[PDB]
Design a protein around this ligand. Structure first.
Ligand SMILES: *[C@@H]1O[C@H](CO)[C@@H](O)[C@H](O)[C@H]1NC(C)=O
Ligand SMILES: *[C@@H]1O[C@H](CO)[C@@H](O)[C@H](O)[C@H]1NC(C)=O
Ligand SMILES: *[C@@H]1O[C@H](CO)[C@@H](O)[C@H](O)[C@H]1NC(C)=O
Ligand SMILES: *[C@@H]1O[C@H](CO)[C@@H](O)[C@H](O)[C@H]1NC(C)=O
Ligand SMILES: *[C@@H]1O[C@H](CO)[C@@H](O)[C@H](O)[C@H]1NC(C)=O
Ligand SMILES: *[C@@H]1O[C@H](CO)[C@@H](O)[C@H](O)[C@H]1NC(C)=O
Lengths: 202, 498
């Protein structure tokens, strides 16, 4: 049979993929079913090392759309669609690629924001990284703030964060400082952590 | 050095691919397609390092398991494009699993363009500067690849770096192979590792400089281990790349398919129109008599290659209903997006184009949008009747140093040890400056930042750093405009008393 026509890969949900297509221009026989193959593409090795500072299938009978469920959030997938008119002699494949949606709170940081202060008044911050994120987390932003002043920032990269095990603020003048934290992943910006306060003794 | 083999169309399995074992030149095309049962293992120990040049085109279509060409064709240097695939000499299409090209010896594509489409894993594309490899990149078609939806961390090994259109980026083919860049005088001849130009008859690479017997490939024609400008008598040009004698063309003729003939010192498949095969000497000779046997202008495209030049192109109206006399180009400056000043991010000059279907508009403001109205006229003299307008919009390029901050970085210190910084804003920038970044730094520590918005900067008249611990601090400043990042100011130092 002819090639399946007009495939469109759309993702309306974080787990659902809705593949749509028109039937082959030349079925040359009574079409029995379609044959959808999907395949996870592995994540890019190099993304973990940069400083920014048979497969499950389905035979679709009498239908021209499919909703693929139970799929990993914000991940690219190779979809191979074929048509069969006897159950094998099937049409040449129709390739299409689709990237799933991210999750809502995958990048949001939970649990207590902890700190330590050393004999030299350095503040070693520690917070638990969001265990299961959208793809991976490419960096973090440390936003400390002294009441009344303007906002300050700091990009903490993967290698830095994973090495120190959180952050380390060296030599700040005394006072009560306000902190907000915002995880930056491949997908976007995980919601700002509620303001914490810490007072470095005078 | 190796043999010259004819073109191949290799399908289903890799078996027939081993017929290429000793080929150094493919006299024809190479098509590789429809291999659904091939696996990575099949290519891991599969290599053709002898292959240097292909005279027609290279096409790769639906080849499963192949992740790179760096091991298949490590020395492929030139694609001549004698025959093309829809005007393309290189086609890499729907190569699912291919992660990189790795054609680290490919220096020149003499004719035709590159079409790389629908390769969902293909990276190491942005690091290749195709303008160094092809004379015209305008007809390239590089779309729907992984490279587009920027997930490629194309990290080069030391490699040379060149500018794209503002962005200075390092150039490489793979994680382990840099892209070779020769001195500008050397361009098509190629060069050695030390940078000495190859001989003028070489193409792409040579083993020793200024020696026409040590070329990797020839610029014009190849004959008897030497690159020659033309085939001298009594030899004939064959397939626009090699010199052959009369006897060879004659043997081909008698084996035939196409029964080869000689014309204009070339051995060609058939006589051109109006000429006929003089049997004896195989020479095409001419036959006496027969041989015995208004609407809208279409598709406007606005392009800007310069900070001041705009190159507008268009097709004529589908129904001219008369002889078109001229075109009428109008341009008009759009001022600037009102909200940009109130958000915190922390007759017109014209031209009558006669006998031409393109215009280059000069003396235009940098990084500015423009409304261009194009019309067509097919009479001008008594009372003009012209076409309905063709609307098109284009944004000019930014300037190089428009956003760079000049003049002394000045400071003051108050009784409460607050440091009021003051520096002159870049008077004429690319559009406008949307914010600034203040980067103070204590020697040894990590970088610190501060986003200073427009209203803030304009109010305070520079910056104001409140309550810093004593010491000598280093400062860098970076203006951020609508266009990009005005170069970091050289490190200044200031010492706050203890
Ligand atoms: C390669 O393909 C041909 C074409 O049908 C087939 O006859 C041959 O058996 C195949 N060889 C292998 C090793 O798959
Ligand atoms: C390549 O050359 C070697 C040299 O002896 C020969 O054994 C081999 O058969 C050749 N390969 C082909 C495909 O002709
Ligand atoms: C490739 O070589 C030809 C032969 O002289 C030359 O005309 C062309 O400009 C070269 N292409 C480049 C340098 O991109
Ligand atoms: C030219 O070919 C030689 C052959 O080994 C190779 O070592 C060299 O790197 C090549 N030079 C360029 C610029 O490709
Ligand atoms: C832009 O193209 C025009 C048309 O050929 C040319 O005259 C001009 O020099 C080009 N400018 C740049 C910067 O390439
Ligand atoms: C400005 O940003 C571009 C983005 O790629 C970068 O290449 C360039 O080096 C930056 N300039 C400075 C002075 O940091």
């Amino acid at each position: 049979p002819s090639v399946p026509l007009d495939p469109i890969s759309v993702s309306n949900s974080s787990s659902q993929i809705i593949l749509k297509w028109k039937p082959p221009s030349d079925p040359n026989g009574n079409i029995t079913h379609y044959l959808v193959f999907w395949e996870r593409q592995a994540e890019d090795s190099e993304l973990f090392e940069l400083d920014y500072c048979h497969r499950p299938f389905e035979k679709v009978v009498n239908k021209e759309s499919l909703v693929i469920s139970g799929l990993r959030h914000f991940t690219g997938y190779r979809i191979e669609l074929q048509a069969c008119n006897q159950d094998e002699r099937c049409s040449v494949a129709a390739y299409v690629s689709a990237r799933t949606m991210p999750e809502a709170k995958a990048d949001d940081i939970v649990g207590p924001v902890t700190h330590e202060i050393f004999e030299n008044n350095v503040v070693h911050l520690m917070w638990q990284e969001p265990k299961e994120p959208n793809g991976l987390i490419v960096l973090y932003e440390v936003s400390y703030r002294r009441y009344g002043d303007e906002e300050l920032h700091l990009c903490v990269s993967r290698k830095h964060f994973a090495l120190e095990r959180g952050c380390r603020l060296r030599g700040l003048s005394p006072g009560n400082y306000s902190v907000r934290i915002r995880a930056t992943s491949l997908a976007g910006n995980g919601s700002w952590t509620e303001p914490t306060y810490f007072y470095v003794t005078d």
